[PDB]
Design an enzyme around this catalytic site. Structure first.
Site, PDB file in Angstrom:
ATOM      1  N   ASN C 151       0.815  -1.213   0.000  1.00 59.17           N
ATOM      2  CA  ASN C 151       0.000   0.000   0.000  1.00 59.17           C
ATOM      3  C   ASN C 151       0.853   1.271   0.000  1.00 59.17           C
ATOM      4  OD1 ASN C 151       0.764  -0.719   2.652  1.00 59.17           O
ATOM      5  ND2 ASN C 151      -0.957   0.409   3.551  1.00 59.17           N
ATOM      6  N   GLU C 250       4.035  -4.926  12.092  1.00 58.86           N
ATOM      7  CA  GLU C 250       2.884  -4.029  12.058  1.00 58.86           C
ATOM      8  C   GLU C 250       1.837  -4.707  11.187  1.00 58.86           C
ATOM      9  OE1 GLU C 250       0.132  -2.469  10.866  1.00 58.86           O
ATOM     10  OE2 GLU C 250       1.199  -1.126   9.508  1.00 58.86           O
ATOM     11  N   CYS C 284      -3.372   1.006   6.996  1.00 55.14           N
ATOM     12  CA  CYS C 284      -3.429   0.112   8.147  1.00 55.14           C
ATOM     13  C   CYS C 284      -4.137   0.768   9.330  1.00 55.14           C
ATOM     14  CB  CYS C 284      -2.013  -0.333   8.507  1.00 55.14           C
ATOM     15  SG  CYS C 284      -0.894   1.026   8.873  1.00 55.14           S
ATOM     16  N   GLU C 462       7.783   1.295  15.258  1.00 52.68           N
ATOM     17  CA  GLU C 462       8.541   2.002  14.239  1.00 52.68           C
ATOM     18  C   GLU C 462       8.545   3.493  14.563  1.00 52.68           C
ATOM     19  OE1 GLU C 462       6.653   0.515  10.620  1.00 52.68           O
ATOM     20  OE2 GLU C 462       8.439  -0.722  10.256  1.00 52.68           O
TER      21      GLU C 462
END
Ligand code: NDP
Ligand code: NDP
Lengths: 488, 488, 488, 488
Positions: C151, C250, C284, C462
């Site tokens: 994405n 993630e 996400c 992150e």
């Protein structure tokens, strides 16, 4: 009375060699609490040599060994809280309802906090290249000195000594001549906990003599000072002139409390009361400039009068007493001079403005809870710290204006805003030039939270992890494993 | 000769209103380099108001926007390294072999370091209870002032301005009247890089006037000072008396270099040479007390004499010149008086000790590299900072002795040990009372490494992450979401 | 089309040894954009040996040398922003108005951030006693692997490689087979900036082969994975079976958006739109469960319809287009099956619910912006991540209820609340079980802000300083200078 | 014989519902110490629900309230040190000279350390722009699980439970079936100290059932595991398959001890003895590959043999006993298989190699202290962890070789070097691929010092400030005070 109070040097009480004494008064009665010996120049030098010897022992112990000793002092302070609070009440005039709940409790809270952080005090390691690296040590300063003030005597002694001791230093502490007694008790408690002889010495005396001798001594590495701006400047100058010493100062202020246009006025009035009349107004962080929207002023004034009427002055050992005399009669005279200047400059007196009278008050240093309104930014009572129970209410029209006016001062200690709005609360606080900011509250000073002033209200900070580090000094060490190159 | 040099205020050169000027000379030739304008009291006030306006612009930018601007200044400094080094050599007398490799290189290293750290400057968040938490902001101080010294003019300007600008402040910088030129060039470079007008202003002048006006100005929040102890004490006094100010100071020292009995003596001599004769001895961290074991003293002295013979005085722009004149004739006179005291107090002159003579030296403030031996701790040349090319060699017998003698001084800036032994190196260094310690090396000052003095050698630190934080002030903010309770 | 795309190993494009290829499609046209080689097991082993060689060169450089190279890569990315954005648009179907503003911009922001933090990565030093101390090093892991999603191909490549490279590691990066092209361009840019050969290798391939081979290689120290929960579980299992690897993940979510009773509904609608239809719902952190008070629901539903009607689907390179096709036709079928489950389970379809038709759409993987309302917590569309443009609106009555329902999920990635009230905003957010929480906003992810999931939405974080540290491993080193005692 | 041991759930002992029991043996006699109930699948579910309830109570307390409760548990452990050590000796076979000096002492040291750090656990605040900022919270994970090993049962329980509890979590702890007794005692001590019911639950059982049920439970947020590599991989796999859980693992190793050419061989031999024969060789960090310079090997072998001859096996409660049996008879059989492989692969058996025999030994799981020399890197005893009293001596020629050989292993737990040389010590240690490195010592693990493995020896770390942080999860919260802009 009490027996003549001696100096505390190297784990025992010892007579001063100065030939000088002073008296501390019970401000509720005017009677002499005790005659106190004053440390002379030779006494100060004795205390420094005692501290140097004890500091070496203390720093050689393991971090957890130091932690355990400070923790035992916490335990003793909890046990003797009520005894110590009553002595503080006698010496300061603050009601027992305050001293038994705040003074030792929050002083011991800070000692307990720092005791647990000693093992977490760490240096750093920096790789430069394969053949060289740097590491740092956070070493003790050595012997440091604390100079306390009279409004929170044992709390101030604990807030200065705790990070200093936890960082591996010895501290020589001089309490205010107005309130010397609880510091001597604290010294005994530390020794009972196992603190090595010399690590905490207490030298009662006068600012002009004992305090000056400490600031001038060549072997003291740091001065931490709480008091007024005038004395802070003298202290700073002398510390520099004699031996370049690190310096921390909390010097009070003229802190603004901003009531937003969407504030609940009962909450705002409650915050304003606690920001002005706790400890009879003798609190460095007090919110003595109360900014109220013009549209709310009249309703706010009524709410303040309602609450001022609930103030209960009386027997300082009575459960329901929540207001005391000032710490001394000379201090009362200064507060009364400020009140009169307010009248003479045209501030509108809403309540109070005089001494308290009648049986049980004529012999104490009592000042009535005092509120001025219609105040303006140029008035003496708005510009200068009074350190008594004197609230100034100021009207304002818009948010940009009130920020400007709150910040237009040489002081910078505290500030607050009352508002239910998310954006307004953070937006205003971020523009205020103060080190201690409260949203929808006032006065709480957790051990974790660094506190200190902007601008003329102070240098450095107390509490929080950073203050433990500020009582160490950094040593940088480069290990060069490669061949050294000379250009000669 | 260069054109008359003006003040730099708000992104432009501007004439001083003081009506006063001074001259800076080339100390290798005696020729006047430039006539320079001196900032008056009114010029300082304009600079403070310029800085206040620019700081607000600078602080409102994003952290990465600030980082990018300082990085552009780094790039310009790298591109003009040799040009700026030549100007520094003309103004200071230091050889181009030094200025082209160290002064701008390491000044720019520190600016580059802090530029990258701006986005990492963070506050804290402390949970108190479900209904209340604290967060802190690291806010800019506002307008700060730096006062530079004449031995490393542009490096000092970069080491002071870099953390101040990176922390969101504006800095007004006053270079030494001896060496004002590169600071003015730096001001132009910052503007070329995109620094907002007013964020870095440069006010040349005399310490007694321009420097004093800065220390006295009420709207300057912090002073950072490099120089001697005598001037440092005056700065501290004025900074406190006028407006309470944060003060940082680096004040030089008498740093000890300890040669262990197992040290390779070629390495020891090489370190000692670099610790005494770089920049013709005009370095604050120089290891001017060289402690050598008695059993190796005679051999060490021989090795020093061989290396001193390799010192090459001459054309300052020649690649092989590694020794320059002192910065001025008054400073050389002071160095010569110390040399005379060494002779009259019975120190043995091993080499040097006189002015240089002949074509190319008669017009400069040149002093021969000088070594004394058979020194004792009470001698003037051993107890006082000379700031010239004068090494003192002292014999010692045992490790405890040398640690005691190394530490028996009011200074505390640097120290070093030469030894291949793991235990000896760390064991000795950990007992030394100095902020900057080198093992088997000398002089390297990485941008990551905090550097500063113990005792009378300074207050605070420069470089490292802690110095970035030291150019902020902590604001603690409590969010109280529960209902506030008043006792009134 | 484009030339067939090769692997990138050790600073050059190289043919795969697998003998295998795959095709990436332009989801706007269905046409083959490029044929791409797929890395086999031998290709992975070659990339690891290359990475091992490059990592050693990279880690031996100075910290500032590493910083400068990564900053040079940032400069190239800014310069090539539009070129790289068009390639990303071709490969992903995301409108150019997004890719040229977000994808490269924020990827480079994170690289720029970490470049500046390299010199601040430091170990610690802990004194134990006079005769012993500990120091720590933050050493590189060595060779780490990143597995990207389709994405945000180049942003994910930058967010994984930036901290890994900044910490001194080499990274082998596997883009999704759906979107392999921009990762190969990044590899070229890193080499152009001066990154040593092997430090960033790119291995296009299939998840079932190249991705599995990476997770199984014994000499890879850490895997960083972005994608769905199903694939995430396989990655962790295989990494554990083969070589005990550190693993970061993630995995997307079903993040709740809570609209409070005092929220402005225009603001709420704007936030809901950006939380659901950016990148055509393929984000996400999207807030795909929108909780609205029952009393406001009908008006909120109207405001959403108004905004959805303004969505502009069309030429992906046209300035006003703000909505694209899905990344692939297989993904569209998955999204359409979920929409059908919504219909069959009794959700009320407010708009969309089918593919787009007509010239310019028949050949692309387009799904209309789709909104369901009257949803209940047992519906498939409310419980499971769809990763397409499908908003689920859920009604609620009470604050405790909406908190329980927001938290009643195995996912934990993001959450948000819309409210002007100070207490409500912080009070609700502190109770939500998500790692990324937005107050009166959505989607902003500063480089400084650690981001990652609670519960089944991920492991580790992150961005932020902590993710730089998470790509190092701690070595603790004790120096014992005292005599070692054996009990044997 | 003791009473049947029950599960400990929610502040009381309670019968298991599994219908299953097991026996723990006294390895010195072979006799049954106790019958112990095994937690079933439903018991695990009950313990989680207990933990969820207690965790909420525990986390709602103040940080200092939690600190005080753990400090009270420390006080009891100190007072009951000898009683607990005796129980540990009975359950494990380790001499009382070890258990009374190390196991509880250092277990309690870590609990004491973390108790003091609770108030220092802080989030961060990051300003983005005037109108927006970020703050972070360090939230508890919730319910975490610890799985212990049998060599240091109560120390492992304390090293796992201390940071988990100090960070605000509840922990369910499963001791090894070999050594379940002291973990049950610890649970009682925690309750006695005031730990809320459910915060520390203990489930004895089998790895294949109780351990697997914990690793699989959906409502456990983190697993901390100590044991062997084979079981650690199974634990990692199940934790991922069930619910994405955070995992910390300490899995033993084959740690190298590098004796330098300039080392004193008595010191080297003493370090080697303590690195191989403490706890009868059942220590994860043992230095079981001893690298000796070829020129010193024969003399080193002589010194080891002399010291091995002084080892005193006997009554485990006798003051002079410093060597015990192995923890179990199955474990002895495994150690004996390794010894036989050494013989059959051509290693020279220097001493030991058999079980101990005679009165007082025939009924215990004794293996003689065993030393092999002339070892090579491909031998099984050199490549695999034995976890018994088996030292392998390997000759080497040069420093580069020994570093290469020390690192040529899938293990990475510990390492050490013996050398008096400053450069050699740091230079060698910096190149070794291990998380725990000792210079001129072995085995000390201060609470401040993070410890854990590189490569296949573990994931994550224990002890130090970082491990407290690793038992929290970061929530990032952005406050957007500006107007939100939507592109739709
Ligand atoms: N630690 C170090 O790096 C240095 C140490 N020194 C030591 O100082 C000794 C004396 O040298 P000298 O040049 O007189 O050093 P100073 O310390 O007097 O000069 C240092 C700087 O301080 C400034 N200054 C001087 N007086 C004041 C004042 N009252 N208020 C504000 N700023 C002031 C000077 O201005 P201006 O020079 O324009 O008058 C100069 O910019 C040297 O022999 C050496 O021992 C000197 C230089 C560097
Ligand atoms: N690093 C260290 O400190 C230690 C390393 N070891 C190494 O491990 C080797 C094997 O010994 P062993 O006793 O089998 O070690 P294990 O690693 O199997 O035992 C360690 C712990 O893990 C538990 N466990 C075992 N299997 C599972 C599972 N499937 N799910 C959850 N928990 C599980 C065990 O339960 P239970 O014991 O009740 O079956 C025990 O509590 C030793 O020879 C030694 O080399 C062993 C102990 C300590």
């Amino acid at each position: 009375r009490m027996a003549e109070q001696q100096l505390y040097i190297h784990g025992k009480f010892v007579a001063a060699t100065s030939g000088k004494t002073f008296e501390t008064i019970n401000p509720a009665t005017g009677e002499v609490l005790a005659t106190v010996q004053a440390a002379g120049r030779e006494d100060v030098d004795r205390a420094v040599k005692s501290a140097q010897q004890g500091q070496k022992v203390w720093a050689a112990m393991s971090a957890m060994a130091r932690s355990r000793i400070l923790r035992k002092a916490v335990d003793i302070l909890r046990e003797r809280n009520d005894e110590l609070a009553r002595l503080e009440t006698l010496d300061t005039g603050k009601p027992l309802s305050e001293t038994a709940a705040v003074d030792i409790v929050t002083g011991a809270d800070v000692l307990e906090y720092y005791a647990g952080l000693i093992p977490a005090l760490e240096g750093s390691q920096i790789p430069l290249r394969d053949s060289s690296f740097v590491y740092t040590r956070r070493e003790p300063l050595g012997v440091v000195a604390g100079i306390g003030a009279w409004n929170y005597p044992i709390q101030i002694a604990l807030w200065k000594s705790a990070p200093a001791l936890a960082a591996g230093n010895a501290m020589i502490f001089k309490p205010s001549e107005v309130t010397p007694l609880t510091a001597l008790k604290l010294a005994e408690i530390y020794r009972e906990a196992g603190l090595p002889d010399g690590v905490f010495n207490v030298l009662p005396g006068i600012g002009a003599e004992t305090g000056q001798y400490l600031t001038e001594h060549p072997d003291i590495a740091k001065i931490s000072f709480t008091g007024g701006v005038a004395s802070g400047k003298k202290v700073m100058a002398n510390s520099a002139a004699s031996s370049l010493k690190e310096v921390t100062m909390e010097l009070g202020g003229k802190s603004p409390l901003i009531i937003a246009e969407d504030a609940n006025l009962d909450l705002a009035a409650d915050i304003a009361m606690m920001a002005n009349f706790y400890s009879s107004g003798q609190v460095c962080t007090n919110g003595t400039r109360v900014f109220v929207p013009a549209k709310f002023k009249a309703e706010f004034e009524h709410k303040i009068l309602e609450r001022v009427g609930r103030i209960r002055a009386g027997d300082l050992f009575a459960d329901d007493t929540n207001f005391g005399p000032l710490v001394s009669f000379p201090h009362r005279q200064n507060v009364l001079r400020y009140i009169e200047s307010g009248k003479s400059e045209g501030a509108r007196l809403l309540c109070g403005g005089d001494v308290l009278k009648g049986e049980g008050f004529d012999n104490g240093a009592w000042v009535a809870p005092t509120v001025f309104t219609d105040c303006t930014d140029d008035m003496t009572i708005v510009r200068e710290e009074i350190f008594g129970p004197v609230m100034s209410i100021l009207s304002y029209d818009d948010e940009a204006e009130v920020i400007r006016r709150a910040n237009a001062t040489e002081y910078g200690l505290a500030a607050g805003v009352v508002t239910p709005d998310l954006n307004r609360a953070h937006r205003i606080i971020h523009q205020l030039e103060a080190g201690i900011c409260w949203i929808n509250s006032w006065g709480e000073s957790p051990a974790e939270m660094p506190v200190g002033g902007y601008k003329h209200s102070g240098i450095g900070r107390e509490n929080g992890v950073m203050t433990l580090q500020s009582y160490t000094q950094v040593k940088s060490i480069q290990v060069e494993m490669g061949p050294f190159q000379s250009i000669f």
